[PDB]
Amino acid sequence: SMQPPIAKPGETWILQAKRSDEFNVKDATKWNFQTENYGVWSWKNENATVSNGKLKLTTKRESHQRTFWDGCNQQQVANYPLYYTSGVAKSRATGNYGYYEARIKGASTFPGVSPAFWMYSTIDRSLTKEGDVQYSEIDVVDLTQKSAVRESDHDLHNIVVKNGKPTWMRPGSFPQTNHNGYHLPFDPRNDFHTYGVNVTKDKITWYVDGEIVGEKDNLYWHRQMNLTLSQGLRAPHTQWKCNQFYPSANKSAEGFPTSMEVDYVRTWVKV
């Protein structure tokens, strides 16, 4: 009975239980709620809560320190001070092709946080031949990370070997293959909406409330990817340089704590 909303007559689709949840319980076997760290925040299991059939992922102003990758100077920096903690749910299981959907309400605070629903692989830096893909990332949606609250991004990221060197492709640098921008017909903080992507060997197609908002050829997105829900920090609390976030001098507590809410995530594969 649960076929995805895009199913056509004649198709059978099978729910991927290891990448789906209705969020009646907090299931730490299925989800990694405290992953490896990146950006300018740290994950805490305590920032992921389940109540009343919804997942809540919360960002907090909380001074702490940890080891931090400083890509500008190509060094890990020990005891690096950071100012915010946040929440993640990363599937322990992986896959690639399928239809993915989540029903999500954004965080009330804007600007400063970005609810996201996305999937990513390990980075394999040992694959060095021309055309080798070392990293695949599909962003189903990044909410509230642009200057206007109704602008959404539905992007792709990858590392691929070009002219013998491993090269990042990002939406900003390769828009024709990696960027889909959309003006939403609603404020995403005010209610739950459905955010989806259909991933096939040939094509990636994005959906918002059942309308098609993005579409690209599947050139570089075939690796095994973990499906993720998370809330990240943005301007004014970040700077972007050398392909990553760095903290800004704005460490305000105003607008925190603030939480995104997830009613469900559902993944299907067509037979």
Q: What is the 3-state secondary structure (H, E, C) of the chain?
A: CCCCCCCCCCCCEEECHHHCECCCCCCCCCEECCCCCCCCEEECHHHEEEECCEEEEEEEEEEEEEEEEEHHHCEEEEEEEEEEEECEEEEEEEECCEEEEEEEECCCCCCCEEEEEEEECCCCCCCCCCCCEEEEEEEEEECCCCCCCCEEECCEEEEEEECCEEEEECCCCCHHHHCCEEECCCCCCCCCEEEEEEECCCEEEEEECCEEEEEEECCCCCCCEEEEEEEEECCCCEEEECCEEEECCCCCCCCCCEEEEEEEEEEEEEC
Tokens of 258: 């603030």
List gaps in the chain by the residue before each (C–N > 2.5 Å): none
Which amino acid appears at position 38 of this protein?
Y
Q: Which amino acid is at 41?
A: W
Number of domains in the chain: 1
| Cβ burial 170-190 (10 Å sphere, 16+ → b, else e) | ebeeeeeebbbebebeeebbe
Resolution, rounded to a tenth of an Å? 1.7
Measure Cα distances from 138 to 87, 100, 117, 121, 216 in Å: 19, 11, 9, 10, 11
Tokens representing 252?
């305000």
CATH at residue 149: 2.60.120.200
CA dist., res. 83 & res. 251, Å (int): 7
Q: In angstroms, rounded to a whole number, what is the distance separating the alpha carbons of residues 29 and 225?
A: 17
Domain of residue 120: give its range: 1-271
Neighbours of 50 (CB within 10 A): 18
Torsion angle, alpha carbons of 110, 115, 120, 125, to 10: 30
CA 209 to CA 64: how far, in whole Å?
A: 39
For residue 94, the Cα-to-chain-centroid distance in whole angstroms is 14
Task: Compute the distance between CA of residue 245 and CA of residue 71 in angstroms, rounded to an integer.
Answer: 10
8 A C-beta contact, residue 137 and residue 157:
yes
Structural biology method used? X-ray
